[PDB]
Design a protein around this nucleic acid. Structure first.
Ligand SMILES: [K+]
Ligand SMILES: [K+]
Ligand SMILES: [K+]
Ligand SMILES: [K+]
Ligand SMILES: [Mg+2]
Ligand SMILES: [Mg+2]
Ligand SMILES: [Mg+2]
Ligand SMILES: [Mg+2]
Ligand SMILES: [Mg+2]
Lengths: 163, 172, 209, 49, 288
RNA sequence: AGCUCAACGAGAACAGAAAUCUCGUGUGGAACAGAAGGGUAAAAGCUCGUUUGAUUCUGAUUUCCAGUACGAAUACGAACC
RNA sequence: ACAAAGGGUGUUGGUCGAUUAAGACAGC
RNA sequence: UCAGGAUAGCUGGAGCUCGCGUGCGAGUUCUAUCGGGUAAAGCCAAUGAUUAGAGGCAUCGGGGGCGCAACGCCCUCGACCUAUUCUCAAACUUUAAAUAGGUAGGACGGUGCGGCUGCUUUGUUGAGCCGCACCACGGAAUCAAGAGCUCCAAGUGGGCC
RNA sequence: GGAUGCGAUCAUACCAGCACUAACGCACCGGAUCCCAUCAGAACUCCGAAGUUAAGCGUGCUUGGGCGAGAGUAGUACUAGGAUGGGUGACCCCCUGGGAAGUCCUCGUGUUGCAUCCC
RNA sequence: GCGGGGAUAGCUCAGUUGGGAGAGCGUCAGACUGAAGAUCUGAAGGUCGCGUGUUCGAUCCACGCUCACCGCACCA
C-alpha cells in the first residue's frame, strides 16, 4: 500500500537459483525446529504461502513458536532511533537452521575441560581466545634470488591480447 | 546376441483409420457409421484445433473421425486396404520410425455396398509396426526409451511388407 | 536541423538503445561497415593498422559514415580498389534524445534525435588490412579519417596477421605445422579435442600448442 | 510555488543522537501469539505441579 | 538441412529432475505429503506401509523417513510364504492379503504388542479396524500405494485388509475393497471374503477346466504340479493364515557370504591405458 | 485421478503454408482472466469425477506505519464440512 | 572566477629509421 | 492539506532506579556463520539487437547458358544447415566484486537425577515447565567523562552548499 | 562384486552413438472369467509362467556435447579511503586497502542409508 | 518546429477480413449511319513515393526517410 505493493522490487530477491527450480527436496520438510534455535530466512519463490516480507529475507532470527507448518521467528528491525524485536510466522520452506553459533558449545566444553585440568594441577589460566598477534623472529634459508625490474613500456601491449 | 531372437519379430501393433471432413453433421455421422461398420468398434470424433476461414472450419467443431484397431481385425482391414491398393506402395509411404500408411478414395472397395444417401467416403490407413518390448515406453512406472537397435526402421518395415505381403515398392 | 556534436560529445546518461520502450528512432547514417575486398582470403593481407580512440566520448553515426567514406576514397585512390579491406569496428547503438522547444522544463523528457556509439579509451575505431606494400597508404588514410572524429585518436600498427587473433610469427608457425584452417578472413586453430574420426589425415594432434 | 519533495538528510544523525537503543531482553518473554493448545497444556501442567 | 535440437545451449540450460523421478519410481508430491510431519510434533516419525507388486513378487514393509534415507522397521515378501505353505499365486489378491497379515504380525512382534493386539484370526470380508486398548493405542501406519492406479479390488487394498486383520491401525475407507459395488455404495462382505480366500481364482479354474481343458493346463500348470484344486484353495489359505499367526518371526538365512566377490562387470580404464589407446588410434589415423 | 504443452522432423486421398490422423524429439521456447515481474511439468497447465474452505467464532501477526485506522495477506485455536 | 580542434624550420630533451674516411649533404 | 495545524523525530527541565570497573553498554574492529544482483563481465550461454565472410544442401526462390519440355545438366544471387566473426542492453543475463546489511562469541551456562500435563507418541515416546546436586578464572580486541526508566513541555516541520 | 524395494544428495548422476553381463532378481512376456478400463486388454486392472535375454535396468568406451574441479585470464576490469595530485576538459597517475568474469589449457564422469536376495 | 490525412495508368480517383490491379477522362482502332453527331465495343496506358521488416503470399500490415495539403499557441 501507499505506493508500493507487498512484493515490489522482488524480481531478483524472490527468484529461484539458476537450474535449481521445480520440486523441493525432502530435507526441507525433514528438519526439526525448537524454541531458541537460530534460523536464517531465505524466501523460496515457489512457496507462496507463509511468505515473509522482503525485509526479513537474508536475516537471522530466533525461534519463539512452533506450529504445524510454520515457525515463529523474532527478527531485529531498525526503526529510526531504536530496534524493534518484530515477531513473524514463516513457513519452514522459507527458513533454514543457522550456523551462527555452531562452535559456541564446543568452545565452552573445551574451556571447561581446560579449566578443570588447570584446577587439578593447581594453576590459574585464561581460556579466552586471542586475535592473531605478531609472529616471532625466525631464520630463512638462503636460496637463489630472482631480480624483478620495472617493465619497459610498449603501447602495443595496452590492449588485452595486443592490438 | 543375435537378430534371430524370437523377441525381435515385427508385428502390426495397430492400424488407424482416419476420415477428416471439413463439415460436421450428417456427413460426419455417416462417416462414423462407415467406420463403425467397418471396424466393429465405436469411432472417436476429432475437433478442430484452430479456426481457418478458407477451410470453413471452427474451433471445437468435430471436423474428423477415426478408429484404432488391433489384432486380427486390424490385420484383415490392412489386407483389404492392400488388396485395394494392389499391394503397391510408394517408397515415401514409409516413415523413418518403422511406420507406414496409405489412402483410399472409395470405401466401397473395402466391401461395403454403395448407399446414395451415405455417399462416397475416402479414408486414410496407417499401420504402426513394433517389436515386442515397446511397452517400456508406454507403461506408467519406469518409462524408458526403446533401444535404438531394437526399434523398427524404415528398411525393416519395407522388408517386412515385401516378405509378408509379397508387395512391390516403387520409387517414382 | 542537427545540433552540433559538442552537445552530445560527453557520455553522461546510461545506455539508451532502441527497444520496445524506446520507439520512433531514426536509422543510423552508417549502414555499411566493411568496404574494399572484404572477400579476400586471410592469407593475402597480413598487415593491419588500427585507428584507436584515446578518449571516452560519444561518436555519432554521421561521423562514422564520413570517416569511412573518406578512408575508403583515399585507399581506392592510392592503393586501388582491390588492395585493402576496411572495417569499422564501432556500431552506434545509443539513442540521443532532444527536448524540442509544454512551456518550460515541464515534461522535458526528449524524443529520439539520433544515434551514436559509446567509445571507451583504447577502443579500436577503424581497422585496415592490406599487404606490406600499402602500409604507408593505410596510415595516411587513417590520418585523413582522424579529422572526421572528435576527441583524440592514435594510429597503431597491429602485430596480428590481418584481422586474425594471432601474431604474425605465431600464425606463420601454425600454418607451417598445418594447424590453421582458413575461414574467410578468420583463421581456425586446430586443437587436440573433439571426435577423432572428424579429423582429416595429418590434422589430428596429440597435444595442443 | 514548488518546494522540496523528500530527503533522508540529517535523519541518521537525529536517530543516533539518543539511539540506536536496544530494548532490554528479560529472561522470560511474553507468551502472547504462541500456540494456544500448547499454552493451555502448559498452564494445566503448572497448575498440577 | 534441419536445425539441431539438442544444442549446446539446450544442454547448458537443461535442469535434471530428481533421480527417482527420472527412473520413474517415486512420485515426490505424494512422498512429501506422506512423510511431512507437524513441526510441533518434533522428531515423531510417520510410519508408512509400503506395498509394491513386481511381476512375480509382492514387497511389503514399514518405513520411516530420515535425512540419511528411509529406515525399514519390518519387511515381508511373498517369496517367503512357501515356508508357511503358499507355493502358487504369489502375486494375487490372496497372496497380497497373506503378505499384509505377515507384515502386521512381524511388526507387532517387533514392538511387543502382539498379545495386546491380535485382530481377528478369521479373515472375514467386512470392514474391520482394531479396537484401541487401555494400555496403549494401536500401531499406526499410512498406506503408500506408489505409482499404481487405485482401482476397486486392487491387490494393494487386499494387502491393506490383510494388515488390518493382522491388527494395524491403517487409516482407510471401504470404497476400494474387492466386492464394493459402484451402483450401490455398499461393501459385499461375501465377495470380499471370496477374493481374500482366492475364490475368484477357483471360479476361473473351474470355468477353464469345463470350457478348455488344454487352456486350463497351460494356464495353471503350477497349480496342477503342486496338486492344488479349486476346492482346496480356501483350506490352503486358512492353513497359511494359521501358520503365519503361529510363527510370524522372520527367518535368518544360514548361508555364509563368500570370502571374495568375483567381478563380472568391466572396470573403468585407467588414464594411462586410455592415453595408450588414444595414441594408437591417432597414429593409425595419421598413417594414411 | 489421469495426461503433457509450444515447436520441429518423418509419413497418410481429397489436403496445399495452414483441416484430421501416426511415430520420434521436445526444460516449458505453451498455458495459467487482465499490466508487468516472479512461480509451476506424473503441475499451479489440459480432460474427467465429486463438491461449495467464496462456511461460523472471535483473538494474534505482517505489509502501510505514528509502529493509528482501512485494504490485503499470513500462522494458530475453537466448530461444521 | 574559462579556452578548444589544428599548426610553428622558436627552442629543449627522447624514440624508431637511412648515408658516411672502399670519403655523408650544398657549390664549384 | 501546499505561507497553516496536529502527529512522530530532534531539545530543555524535573527527576527516579542502580553502579565505581566485577560494567545488561558501543555510528569500531576480530573470529565464525548467512543474504544480495550493483560495478565489472558475457553473448564463442537464455531473451533482444547487430557486421562480415567460409564450407555444404533442396521434386518445393529470382536469373544466365546448354534445351520444345524433362523429378535434364553447369554457374550467379537469395534463402536454409554447419563451424566462425565485428559490435551492444536502465526496464537482458550464466557468472559476479569492492563498499555496505543480518546473526553469535556464557553467570538469563552446562551436566546428572526426580517431578507436572487435560499437549504429543504404538510406546512416562517426545515438547515445554518445575525441584535437588555439582561444576562454571568471567570465556575475542579496544573503549566504556557509567547504565536503565519515567513525566511535563518549547522551538522546528520554506532550507541551502 | 552386484541386483531388487524404499530413499538422501539432485548431471562427476544428463544427452548421443557403440560393446558386454555368471546366479537370484528386475523385466520383457501369455490370456481377459472375475474386479477394473478404454474408440482401442495400446494404457490401466485382474489371472498366470509357455518363451526370451532382443529390449528395459546395470556396467564399460568415445582425442563426443554437457556438467564439476583446477590453472590462467590477472593483480587485469572494477572498487572503499587520500591528496592545495596531473590535465582546458574528457579522463588519468600515485598513496593506504579489497579484488572479479568469457576465450584458451588440464583433470574427473558419481558418492551413499536401511531391508531382502545371489555370488 | 509539432499533430493529422495523402502519395496508384498521360490526368482525376476506388480498393483491400492482406491471394483482383480496377473505374471516369485522354489516344488509337472497330461497330452503327445515305454521311455525320451521339452511342457501343476492343486495345494501350501501373518501380501502387523510396529503403527495410512480418507473412506461404504485401498496394494493403509495421518501422525509417522523401514530396506536397490542413490545424497549431492565454493574462501581462
Ligand atoms: K580527431
Ligand atoms: K560474465
Ligand atoms: K545474445
Ligand atoms: K509541530
Ligand atoms: Mg494432480
Ligand atoms: Mg505549530
Ligand atoms: Mg545498497
Ligand atoms: Mg539387454
Ligand atoms: Mg566432453
Amino acid at each position: 500500500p501507499a505506493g508500493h505493493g507487498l512484493r515490489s522490487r522482488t524480481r531478483d530477491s524472490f527468484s529461484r537459483a539458476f537450474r535449481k527450480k521445480g520440486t523441493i527436496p525432502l530435507s526441507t520438510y525433514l528438519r526439526i525446529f525448537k524454541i531458541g534455535d537460530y534460523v536464517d530466512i531465505k524466501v523460496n519463490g515457489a512457496i507462496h504461502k507463509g511468505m515473509p516480507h522482503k525485509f526479513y529475507h537474508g536475516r537471522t532470527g530466533r525461534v519463539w513458536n512452533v506450529t504445524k507448518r510454520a515457525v515463529g521467528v523474532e527478527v531485529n528491525k531498525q526503526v529510526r532511533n531504536k530496534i524493534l524485536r518484530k515477531r513473524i510466522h514463516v513457513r519452514i520452506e522459507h527458513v533454514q537452521l543457522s550456523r551462527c553459533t555452531e562452535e559456541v558449545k564446543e568452545r565452552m566444553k573445551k574451556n571447561d575441560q581446560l579449566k578443570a585440568e588447570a584446577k587439578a594441577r593447581g594453576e590459574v589460566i585464561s581460556t579466552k581466545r586471542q586475535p592473531v598477534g605478531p609472529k616471532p623472529g625466525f631464520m630463512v634459508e638462503g636460496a637463489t634470488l630472482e631480480t624483478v625490474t620495472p617493465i619497459p613500456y610498449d603501447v602495443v601491449n595496452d590492449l588485452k591480447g595486443g592490438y | 546376441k543375435k537378430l534371430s531372437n524370437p523377441m525381435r519379430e515385427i508385428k502390426v501393433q495397430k492400424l488407424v483409420l482416419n476420415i477428416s471432413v471439413g463439415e460436421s453433421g450428417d456427413r460426419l455421422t455417416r462417416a462414423a457409421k462407415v467406420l463403425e461398420q467397418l471396424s466393429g468398434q465405436s469411432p472417436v470424433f476429432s475437433k478442430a484445433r484452430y479456426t481457418v476461414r478458407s477451410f470453413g472450419i471452427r474451433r471445437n467443431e468435430k471436423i474428423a473421425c477415426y478408429v484404432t484397431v488391433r489384432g486380427e481385425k486390424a490385420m484383415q482391414l490392412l489386407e483389404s486396404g492392400l488388396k485395394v491398393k494392389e499391394y503397391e506402395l510408394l517408397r515415401r509411404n514409409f516413415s523413418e520410425t518403422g511406420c507406414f500408411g496409405f489412402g483410399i478414395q472409395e470405401h466401397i472397395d473395402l466391401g461395403i455396398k454403395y448407399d446414395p444417401s451415405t455417399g462416397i467416403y475416402g479414408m486414410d490407413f496407417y499401420v504402426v509396426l513394433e517389436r515386442p518390448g515397446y511397452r517400456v515406453a508406454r507403461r506408467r512406472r519406469c518409462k524408458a526409451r526403446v533401444g535404438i537397435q531394437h526399434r523398427v526402421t524404415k528398411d525393416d518395415a519395407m522388408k517386412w511388407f515385401q516378405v509378408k505381403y509379397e508387395g512391390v515398392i516403387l520409387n517414382k | 536541423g542537427r545540433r552540433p556534436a559538442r552537445c552530445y560529445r560527453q557520455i553522461k546518461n546510461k545506455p539508451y538503445p532502441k527497444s520496445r520502450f524506446c520507439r520512433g528512432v531514426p536509422d543510423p547514417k552508417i549502414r555499411i561497415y566493411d568496404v574494399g575486398m572484404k572477400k579476400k582470403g586471410v592469407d593475402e593481407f597480413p598487415f593491419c593498422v588500427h585507428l584507436v580512440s584515446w578518449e571516452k566520448e560519444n561518436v555519432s553515426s554521421e561521423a562514422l559514415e564520413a570517416a569511412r567514406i573518406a578512408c575508403n576514397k583515399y585507399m581506392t585512390k592510392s592503393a586501388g580498389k582491390d588492395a585493402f579491406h576496411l572495417r569499422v569496428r564501432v556500431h552506434p547503438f545509443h539513442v540521443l534524445r532532444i527536448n524540442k522547444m509544454q512551456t518550460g522544463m515541464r515534461g522535458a523528457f526528449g524524443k529520439p534525435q539520433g544515434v551514436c556509439a559509446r567509445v571507451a579509451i583504447g577502443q579500436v575505431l577503424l581497422s585496415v588490412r592490406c599487404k606490406d606494400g600499402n602500409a604507408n597508404h593505410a596510415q595516411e588514410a587513417l590520418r585523413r579519417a582522424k579529422f572526421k572524429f572528435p576527441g583524440r585518436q592514435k594510429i597503431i600498427v597491429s602485430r596480428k596477421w590481418g584481422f586474425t587473433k594471432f601474431s604474425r610469427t605465431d600464425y606463420l608457425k601454425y600454418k607451417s605445422e598445418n594447424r590453421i584452417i582458413p575461414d574467410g578472413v578468420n583463421a581456425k586453430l586446430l586443437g587436440c579435442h573433439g571426435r577423432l574420426a572428424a579429423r582429416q589425415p595429418g590434422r589430428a594432434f596429440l597435444e595442443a600448442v | 510555488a514548488k518546494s522540496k519533495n523528500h530527503t533522508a538528510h540529517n535523519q541518521s544523525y537525529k536517530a543516533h543522537r539518543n539511539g540506536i537503543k536496544k530494548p532490554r531482553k528479560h529472561r522470560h518473554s511474553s507468551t502472547k501469539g504462541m500456540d494456544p493448545k500448547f499454552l493451555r497444556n502448559q498452564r494445566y501442567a503448572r497448575k498440577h505441579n | 538441412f534441419i536445425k539441431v535440437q539438442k544444442t549446446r545451449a539446450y544442454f547448458k540450460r537443461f535442469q535434471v529432475k530428481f533421480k527417482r523421478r527420472r527412473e520413474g519410481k517415486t512420485d515426490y508430491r505424494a512422498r512429501n505429503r506422506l512423510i511431512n510431519q507437524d513441526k510441533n510434533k518434533y522428531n515423531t516419525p510417520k510410519y508408512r506401509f509400503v506395498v509394491r507388486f513386481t511381476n512375480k513378487d509382492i514387497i511389503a514393509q514399514i518405513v520411516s523417513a530420515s535425512i540419511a534415507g528411509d529406515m525399514i522397521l519390518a519387511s515381508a515378501y511373498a517369496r517367503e510364504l512357501p515356508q508357511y505353505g503358499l507355493k502358487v499365486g504369489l502375486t494375487n489378491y490372496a497372496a497380497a492379503y497373506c503378505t499384509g497379515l505377515l507384515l502386521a504380525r512381524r511388526v507387532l512382534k517387533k514392538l511387543e504388542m502382539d498379545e495386546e493386539y491380535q485382530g481377528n484370526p478369521e479373515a472375514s470380508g467386512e470392514d474391520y479396524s482394531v479396537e484401541p486398548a487401555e494400555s496403549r493405542r494401536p500401531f499406526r501406519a499410512l498406506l503408500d500405494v506408489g505409482l499404481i492406479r487405485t482401482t476397486t479390488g486392487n491387490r494393494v487394498f487386499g494387502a491393506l485388509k490383510g494388515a488390518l486383520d493382522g491388527g494395524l491401525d491403517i487409516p482407510h475407507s471401504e470404497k476400494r475393497f474387492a466386492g464394493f459395488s459402484k451402483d450401490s455404495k455398499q461393501l459385499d462382505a461375501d465377495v470380499h471374503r471370496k477374493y481374500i480366500y482366492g475364490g475368484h481364482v477357483a471360479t476361473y479354474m473351474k470355468t477353464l477346466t469345463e470350457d478348455e481343458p488344454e487352456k486350463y493346463q497351460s494356464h495353471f500348470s503350477e497349480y496342477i504340479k503342486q496338486g492344488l484344486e479349486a476346492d482346496d484353495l480356501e483350506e490352503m489359505y486358512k492353513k497359511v493364515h494359521a501358520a503365519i499367526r503361529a510363527d510370524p518371526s522372520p527367518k535368518k538365512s544360514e548361508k555364509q557370504p563368500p570370502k571374495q566377490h568375483k567381478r563380472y562387470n568391466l572396470k573403468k580404464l585407467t588414464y594411462e591405458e586410455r592415453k595408450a589407446k588414444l595414441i594408437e588410434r591417432l597414429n593409425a589415423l595419421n598413417s594414411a
